[PDB]
Write an enzyme that holds these catalytic residues in place. Structure first.
Site, PDB file in Angstrom:
ATOM      1  N   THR C   1       8.604   7.246  -5.316  1.00 11.60           N
ATOM      2  CA  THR C   1       8.363   6.293  -4.188  1.00 11.60           C
ATOM      3  C   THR C   1       7.015   5.559  -4.258  1.00 11.60           C
ATOM      4  O   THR C   1       6.161   5.875  -5.080  1.00 11.60           O
ATOM      5  CB  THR C   1       8.544   7.045  -2.834  1.00 11.60           C
ATOM      6  OG1 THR C   1       7.606   8.074  -2.571  1.00 11.60           O
ATOM      7  CG2 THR C   1       9.960   7.557  -2.665  1.00 11.60           C
ATOM      8  N   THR C   2       6.780   4.471  -3.471  1.00  8.88           N
ATOM      9  CA  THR C   2       5.596   3.657  -3.572  1.00  8.88           C
ATOM     10  C   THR C   2       5.408   2.768  -2.387  1.00  8.88           C
ATOM     11  O   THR C   2       6.342   2.285  -1.739  1.00  8.88           O
ATOM     12  CB  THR C   2       5.484   2.857  -4.889  1.00  8.88           C
ATOM     13  OG1 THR C   2       4.231   2.288  -5.094  1.00  8.88           O
ATOM     14  CG2 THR C   2       6.577   1.754  -5.075  1.00  8.88           C
TER      15      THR C   2
END
Lengths: 48, 242, 202, 202, 242, 242, 242, 242, 242
Positions: C1-2
């Protein structure tokens, strides 16, 4: 108050005068306070 | 009165807490501490008057540093004030730790009022017989007075202690709302001069202040008291002859 | 994720991907990674959903209590530091979340990046957070402008996540972007945001 | 991730390389890893950003509490012991960090090395600490004389870490110098530092 | 003397245990605050007249944000008020932490009553000598009085403190449920006027509202309060002719 | 004097508790409540006719849903009710937590009393001067009154509060154990009408019940209440002409 | 006076605590202890006078060592001193634990006056009723009187005890800030000999002193008091002929 | 006095804690315990007669063993004697636990005084109504008297209880330091003769002593007592020819 | 002296605990129990006499085993004995748990007494209202009396309760130290008869004993009480003929 006035005039006599002044008054007052105060305000040294 | 003043738990049918008021009669035994709040800073002036010439003038003071831009005075017991104000340091500290924002003078006052407040409610432990003047500048100057209850009152000119009634009368008359830091400083030296009822020497008094630009606490050296004190002595002598 | 963040002179603009993908997994149809802390304050997380959401409830609740206490809007710093401290006191229950708590206050606009060891640190330029962060920096640092608006900032927050997504299998989609132009709290919401990258692919 | 420090003859200089990376997020490269304890006291950290700033904030608060309560500026030894006793307090979770606390005080200049667990030992004029420790000792001691000043001490601080950087790969590029001479507490930050060693490396 | 108001662990033979009705007398002595309920909101008004020009004309506060949709106003000790107002703000938020639902005026009210009663029930601690008015619009406007007893009483419109009886009579006649926000606001400014037997100037009163069509707390600005007051003063003057 | 009545941990020389006997009268000092058991359910009727037009017609409330199928009325001090019913409700759901069992009417009151036993024995805390009547259908209808002491009495018809003495007399001749639900409902109201000495208006009195067909708490709104009241009001008239 | 002295919680009407007043009498019944501070050190002398030859050669112990360069001496209740001093040693060790610095006399004094303050707040525990003169040399010589109230006061020459008044009067004339190390300690023997109204010998006085130039506390042998005593007798004699 | 003596907390206008000095009257009634120091050890002699002759008065017993060179005799409550001695025992063995040193005479006395004193300052608990004399030779003779106050006075000979009066007035003339082991043991036995006003039997008396050249507490059997008792009986009788 | 008797934290000005004096009168409003020591063991007898025949004297107990070689009798409240013997049983056995040793008579007497002292320190607990006589054989017979004050005294014949005075006058004449088992038993029985002023019936007396020779406790049935009670009763008849 009538006794204090009498003390003051007597104080004058001791001081070799007939003139009553403020120092004659202050002792006269203390004499009567002696009886009925002291209450110490010497605990004011413990208060900031 | 008569058992409805002999514990703190009680009330009276007057609806007073007589115990708290007696705690406030403690504030009035001790010496006067006076604050003025002006738009360019806040001024704190404390009594440092010694009972003897064998008493050391350095600590008998009221003025405590609390924060970089907060100082304060106390009136009440000596004993109660140092413990109470070491609590106000901690509290100021907690705020800096957890928000990383130096404590505003207003928030501080609400927090330390609520601390006195657990001791007023509780029966097992007495309230402090202290009022504070909490003076600082956050973005713009602030001045609050803490009551012995824990009540919190915002002021612009205020006193506690023995000299208080005359200082109340004094700032009615004399104080103006256009005054600078310098002009209101002198006026507070005339006001301390009034309460102690002599022309001040600059070794029986102590001044701390916070300006907005400096945004700091300073403590005024004897060297640096003197121009305010000399200016003062001139107007103080006039009130002791009239 | 980011998750990405940048500090503009007109606001703060940040972005999340709502999906949290293990590597093929679909966590949920839609979920929250953008938490509205105030109309001027935002919380954009990369990490666990559940810890992020847990911390967010606390924080939303303390932002409004801190406001009522000072009678003054929460500062960016004050929410940031609270979260550093909240994490370290309640670490008895494990935490694996990186937070970006940012917004707008009198001092300006700033973002604070918080890791779950603690810390809150000042960012006035570029910040990105997560497993897609390394790729994201490549994009953001070359195309940064100091004088940048929020208008060209959204295009960038898209571009940065969009590259992490196309080179990480553990980076889900459902890209939401939040913009805080100091006038409102806009959520573009998934449908428009998907069309910003429709014109970066084809 | 390596730190240096040296007593000059007139100030204390310490330096810290910015580049901290954990996983695929770079924490530090543009954000600090030195914190202000008192006016001319600092604490430098080698280890995680999160651990380093959370523990330093307490020490910083209590440094203020020291100063105000007793009207006494705390010494390097005073801050040093306190930090040791607090690292005793919690050690259930990550709290293993290598701290150097030094600066100026009213009994001279001192550096004290605080061990990860607790304990504090003193260093006459050269310290290191980190994983670049071995390379740093050589560079600092050869160019250390009793008569070096603060200007040429800041130059040295950069040289120890950047010679060390090569042998290491727990560290990368981006570096901060701090100079504590009692006339400034200045934080050099990447821009300036890269430029001074641009003349002393090429 | 009574001997049934030494502690709160005593009762009267009368059933009207005196020591909490002496916590009631504490309220009365304090200065006024009025809650006025309309169909377009609720309006809430409280003293800020306190002190002379030593005191701030911006004294903070009697008109508390509790939520961003709930306000509270007080009478009794502002010390006892302080700690209680603190708990109110956290409690309200605590409903929010564990539900993410706005606490309704009725539910908020029951929780402060419960807090009060902790201090009321135990004999090793005294009640808070403070009363509270809680005004909000959850989605229906609501107004309660919480007693220092931590007892709950609902009103159409109500007041507390020194001016309780004057306002009480005022709304007895005039109050209707068909008042609009404007009508009810000006009517409560007349009633506050009477309480202090004087006019209203915008610095003697702080006035807030929770609106129906926004359901958010907003405090009326000093010059924004000036036209309501301007129309109110006309009436306060007619009645102080009498 | 007399008592031996400033401590609850001291018994009077009669052997009584003055403190509790005194706290029994505070139930009476507060408002009436009428509970009536019939063979087709149990009706609890609570007085909510109090104060002038300054209060709302809803005045809380006085007839709380304790459980799904158990309700209680209160008479006496409100503050004490607020906490008592709090514990009552939590204990009702606790039985379902540990047994998944709808709490019996009987057991619920026994434990309302058990809490109150603790505040009668331990001198560190006041007695609660409040009485709840507990009406429900476990599977047969049962009506209890809980007492401040923690004494526990099953009734089949009762009054408490202001009408406690009056209504006991009303029911010697009138009340039987062969009444219908409707009859009973009207007769509990005649008696309530007797207590205040006036015609009843259903727009300020609150009635709930639990039937045996239902096994659920329901509440009677004033539109429904109208025919019951109309059959009560003839009889309240008959009474106040003799 | 009455009822304000039955606990430490209660204040009297003037704002005085009469409990606390009785605690100064507690200082004054006990044996005299005098401190005289000079530029070169600070000397602390306390009365070792015994009413019998059946008491020890040195009766343990009038002047305590409490840190490397910090000592205190006692007047008032010597029972409480044992506990007070057990604590004073520990607090001064403690600061050596946590910053590994010699504690300053001031901060040591603050902390012990917090420990009094702790028993002053609580009304369960009666406060300390003994006064200590804590003396040591840090940055410069410092000398305090820490009172039963939990207050510190700094003096430049001091007294407490029976002799308290006599030695305030003596130093007012005789003490000056021009006094050497030797001229000061000798002047305290003169002060002590008036106080007892007898010539001094080594077995009825106990002397320690603090040097600057060694930066260490030493406790002076009865043997090395002998020269100073001799020097002292002349002045004492003259004073006892006046 | 009155009212400054029916609690532990109260101070009197004198500064004395009359409560503690009334537990020294609890000691004062029953019985002689005598301590006598000499330069060749310390001898502790104590009463051991108790009631009539049904009572076995050859046991119970004042001279309790506390260490291998520490013994104490008791005067006052037997009830208090057991716990205080037991604590004393605990503290002695803590020094062995933790320093692998038998504790010194001074420190044990110092400690056990502090223990009594802790209990003085707490209210709702009293100090112990017993007094000990702490006799030991660490490497040096010491003889202490530890007080129910929790104060420490070292003597070279004293007595507590009924015989206190007799032994003081005797020791004015007789006591000297030129006493040996033998001269002291007989001389304290004469001292005790005067105190009960009779000749001694080695059945009703018990002696323990701590010698410098053994460093043991030893407890003297009645056969061993008897020679010394012969020496003393002639002296005691000549002195009861007054 | 008046009012130094309504706390146990309170000594009187005469020295004595009158609180304890009033705790020794509860024993004497109990039933006598006599213990007599012989060389062949130790015998414990107790008045099981009951004021009616609706109670069953046999089961009402009086005298309980405590250890397998220690027995104990009570006088005072039944109630306080129950807590005290349950204490006893647990303590006697606790010695066996950590030493595997049956408890020594002195030592149990001591541990029960330390329990009883602890209830005499704190004003928060009522001191015990019984006395026990503790009689067993450890290795030698011992016969103690514990006191409510928590004191222990060795005796060779003793009583507790209302007969305490008479059994003292009796054993003053007839007690010998050279008694056998059969003689001691008889003598104790005779003595109990004086105290009740009447003959013994086997069915209202309990006797338990512990021999030295056997070291096992055994309890005397009515059947085996018979031989002893004929021989004792003849003597009682003669003695109370006078």
């Amino acid at each position: 108050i009538k006794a204090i006035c009498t003390e003051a005039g007597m104080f004058a006599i001791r001081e070799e005068r007939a003139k009553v002044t403020m120092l004659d008054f202050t002792k006269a007052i203390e004499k009567v306070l002696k009886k009925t105060t002291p209450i110490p305000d010497l605990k004011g040294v413990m208060f900031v | 009165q008569m058992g409805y003043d002999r514990a703190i738990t009680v009330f009276s049918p007057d609806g007073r807490l007589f115990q708290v008021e007696y705690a406030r009669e403690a504030v009035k035994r001790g010496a006067t501490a006076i604050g003025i709040k002006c738009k360019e800073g806040v001024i704190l002036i404390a009594d440092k008057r010694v009972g003897s010439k064998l008493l050391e003038a350095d600590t008998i003071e009221k003025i405590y540093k609390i924060d970089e831009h907060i100082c304060a005075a106390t009136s009440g017991l000596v004993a109660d004030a140092r413990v109470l104000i070491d609590r106000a340091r901690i509290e100021a500290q907690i705020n800096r730790l957890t928000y990383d924002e130096p404590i505003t003078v207003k928030e501080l006052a609400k927090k330390i009022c609520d601390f006195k407040q657990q001791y007023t409610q509780y029966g097992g432990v007495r309230p402090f017989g202290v009022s504070l003047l909490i003076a600082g500048v956050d973005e713009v100057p602030k001045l609050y007075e803490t009551d012995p209850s824990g009540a919190l009152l915002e002021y612009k000119a205020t006193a506690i202690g023995m000299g208080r009634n005359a200082v109340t009368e004094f700032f009615e008359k004399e104080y103006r709302d256009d005054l600078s830091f310098d002009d209101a400083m002198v006026l507070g030296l005339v006001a301390m001069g009034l309460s102690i009822e002599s022309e001040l020497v600059p070794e029986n008094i102590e001044v701390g202040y916070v300006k907005v630009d400096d945004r700091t606490f300073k403590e005024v050296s004897p060297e640096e008291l003197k121009p305010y004190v000399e200016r003062a002595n001139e107007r103080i002598r006039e009130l002791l002859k009239k | 994720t980011t998750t990405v963040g940048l500090v503009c002179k007109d606001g703060v603009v940040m972005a999340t991907e709502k999906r949290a993908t293990m590597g093929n997994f679909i966590a949920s149809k839609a979920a929250k990674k953008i938490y509205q802390i105030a109309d001027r304050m935002a919380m954009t997380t990369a990490g666990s959903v559940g810890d992020a959401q847990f911390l967010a409830r606390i924080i939303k609740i303390e932002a409004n209590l801190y406001e009522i206490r000072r009678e003054r809007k929460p500062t960016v710093r004050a929410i940031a530091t609270l979260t550093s401290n909240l994490l370290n006191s309640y670490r008895y229950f494990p935490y694996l979340v990186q937070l970006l708590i940012g917004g707008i206050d009198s001092e300006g606009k700033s973002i604070y990046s918080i890791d779950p060891i603690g810390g809150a640190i000042e960012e006035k330029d570029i910040v990105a957070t997560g497993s897609g962060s390394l790729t994201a920096y490549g994009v953001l640092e070359d195309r940064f402008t100091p004088e940048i608006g929020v208008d060209e900032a959204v295009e960038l927050a898209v571009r940065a996540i969009y590259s992490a997504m196309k080179r990480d299998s553990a980076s889900g989609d459902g890209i939401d972007v939040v913009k805080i132009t100091e006038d409102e709290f806009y959520q573009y919401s998934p449908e428009e945001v998907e069309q910003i990258l429709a014109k970066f692919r084809k």
